[PDB]
Ligand binder design. Structure first.
Ligand code: NLI
Lengths: 11, 26, 249
């Protein structure tokens, strides 16, 4: 449902 | 120090669509 | 928010979204009170009866947003947490007394047209504005009914007399709480709801035109039931704990 955020932030 | 003054409203002296309702109840 | 409206862009530049890393989902609202500090409800981080016990590394804060689900490139800032502080005497066992937490961001966030901290009230501001009948404003991306909005929702609600708040529920009310909402005969509606928790209840001071955060969306029985009211953490009553945490850490 939520658009993916930049990968780095999930780091 | 600059708290609670919105760049797109207070700072430009524009009012949002329903802030009047708040001030009136006071 | 139930029976609210779409916010306007820039309407609540202090509004913060607590966002879960995995699964990626909306946890709560929160509010930006400086370049480095975010204010929210303790029950957003810690609530053992639902096995909720999040730490610094489980969450992201998203500042500057309007859309609930888009990644608002060039507009929103996403920050990581350095530390979470929960009020030592937060009563999750009984009535959510002292429902408050502070969050310290890893790095300061740059203010913009869409990002800007709300004021904390001082004693005189609180005494003047915190009054039955006076309206405040609540914002959030939470549930529309007791389904989910595409943009930030807003609703303005009157503060309700304490005896009426007490007489609406079996829950023990304390001085650290107030309730707000329309009464059943007033013929207007609205309330916060799930996913609105930790959001700011704000009033605009008539004396200096500034926005002040008086409450934090805390708890309710259902959402927008007649004869029930939203409860809010009383920010000024806990302000000493807030100042203590901030200039110590
Ligand atoms: C964490 C949580 C648990 N219980 C909720 N409401 C049920 C209750 F009223 F019976 C209750 C039970 C224990 C302690 C206090 C109250 C409750 O509302 N929460 C927090 C949460 O659900 N808040 C979402 C915003 O809800 N507030 C409004 N309905 N305006």
């Amino acid at each position: 449902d939520f658009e993916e955020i930049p990968e780095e932030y999930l780091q | 120090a600059d708290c609670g003054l919105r760049p797109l409203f207070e700072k430009k002296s524009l009012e949002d669509k329903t802030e009047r309702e708040l001030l009136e109840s006071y | 928010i139930v029976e609210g409206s779409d916010a306007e862009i820039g309407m609540s530049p202090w509004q913060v979204m607590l966002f879960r890393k995995s699964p990626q989902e909306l946890l709560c609202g929160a509010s930006l009170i400086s370049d480095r500090w975010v204010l929210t409800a303790a029950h957003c981080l810690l609530y053992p009866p639902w096995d909720k016990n999040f730490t610094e590394n489980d969450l992201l804060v998203r500042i500057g947003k309007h859309s609930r689900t888009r990644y608002e490139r060039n507009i929103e800032k996403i920050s990581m947490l350095e530390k979470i502080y929960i009020h030592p005497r937060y009563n999750w066992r009984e009535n959510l007394d002292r429902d408050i937490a502070l969050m310290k961001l890893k790095k300061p966030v740059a203010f913009s047209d869409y990002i800007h901290p709300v004021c904390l009230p001082d004693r005189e501001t609180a005494a003047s504005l915190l009054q039955a009948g006076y309206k405040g404003r609540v914002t959030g991306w939470g549930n529309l009914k007791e389904g989910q909005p595409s943009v930030l929702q807003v609703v303005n609600l009157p503060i309700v007399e304490r005896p009426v708040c007490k007489d609406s529920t079996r829950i023990r009310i304390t001085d650290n709480m107030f309730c707000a909402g329309y009464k059943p005969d007033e013929g207007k509606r609205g309330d916060a709801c799930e996913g609105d928790s930790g959001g700011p209840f704000v009033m605009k001071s008539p004396f200096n035109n500034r926005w002040y955060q008086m409450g934090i969306v805390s708890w309710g029985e259902g959402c927008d039931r007649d004869g029930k009211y939203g409860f809010y953490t009383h920010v000024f009553r806990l302000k000493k704990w807030i100042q203590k945490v901030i200039d110590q850490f």
